[PDB]
Design a protein around this ligand. Structure first.
Ligand code: PT
Ligand code: PT
Ligand code: PT
Ligand code: PT
Ligand code: PT
Length: 128
């Protein structure tokens, strides 16, 4: 699934991300847009043989096991393929773990392209 902005924002709100560890919902919607362009199926390969998976492009080196990367730690305790589902639950729950671990610094595209902007604009004009 390729979500639309307010659709994802509502789905993220209900899985408890508005304001998780001080990050408002627009931050997560913004990160999802630049990480994955809302695509629950996105996968990106990395120079170290790791892969980022799902709407939030969570990396197999630390977070999930895809059986095709070293050397990984599987700290969310899930297979990475679980992060490519149309229901964002596993990704949101893994993302809570990652920000419990330097805040949203883990997401390069977030610090690059969201941090510093009026991130609340991302959710404006949505019934939440
Ligand atoms: Pt799909
Ligand atoms: Pt849901
Ligand atoms: Pt949830
Ligand atoms: Pt603005
Ligand atoms: Pt809307």
């Amino acid at each position: 699934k390729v979500f639309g902005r307010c659709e994802l924002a509502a789905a993220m709100k209900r899985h408890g991300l508005d304001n998780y560890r001080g990050y408002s919902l627009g931050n997560w919607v913004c990160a999802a847009k630049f990480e994955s362009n809302f695509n629950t199926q996105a996968t990106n390969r990395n120079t170290d043989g790791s892969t980022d998976y799902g709407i939030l492009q969570i990396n197999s080196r630390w977070w999930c096991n895809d059986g095709r990367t070293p050397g990984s730690r599987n700290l969310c305790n899930i297979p990475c393929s679980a992060l490519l589902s149309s229901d964002i639950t596993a990704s949101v729950n893994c993302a809570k773990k990652i920000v419990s671990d330097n805040g949203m610094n883990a997401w390069v595209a977030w610090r690059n392209r969201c941090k510093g902007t009026d991130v609340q604009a991302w959710i404006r004009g949505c019934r939440l």
